[PDB]
C-alpha cells in the first residue's frame, strides 16, 4: 500500500464513542471538531 497522501479509497476503521447530550463536551463528527452541548434539534436537515 501507498501512504503518500491522495484520495484514499481504503481506510482503517474510525472509532466512534457513545454520544452524550445536554452536557458540555468536546465533540468530533467526521472531522468536524467543536466544544459545546448537544441537544435535540427541531430544525429539519435535508438528507445530504
Amino acid at each position: 500500500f501507498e501512504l503518500l497522501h491522495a484520495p484514499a479509497t481504503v481506510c482503517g476503521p474510525k472509532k466512534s464513542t457513545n454520544l452524550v447530550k445536554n452536557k458540555c463536551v468536546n465533540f468530533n463528527f467526521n472531522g468536524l471538531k467543536g466544544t459545546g452541548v448537544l441537544t435535540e434539534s427541531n430544525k429539519k436537515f435535508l438528507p445530504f
Binding site: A6, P7, T9, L46, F48
Partner: protein
C-alpha cells in the same frame, strides 16, 4: 440536490450521452447542455 460524489480521480475533457434504443428505433428526445463558469 447532490446525488453522488465519486472518488474517480481521473481527468475529463469530453463527454458523450447514452440513449437507449427501445423496441434501431427510438422516440424523439429533447436535451440541453450548458457549461459551468
Amino acid at each position: 440536490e447532490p446525488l453522488v460524489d465519486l472518488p474517480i480521480g481521473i481527468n475529463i475533457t469530453r463527454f458523450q450521452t447514452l440513449l437507449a434504443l427501445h423496441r434501431w428505433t427510438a422516440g424523439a428526445a429533447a436535451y440541453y447542455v450548458g457549461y459551468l463558469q
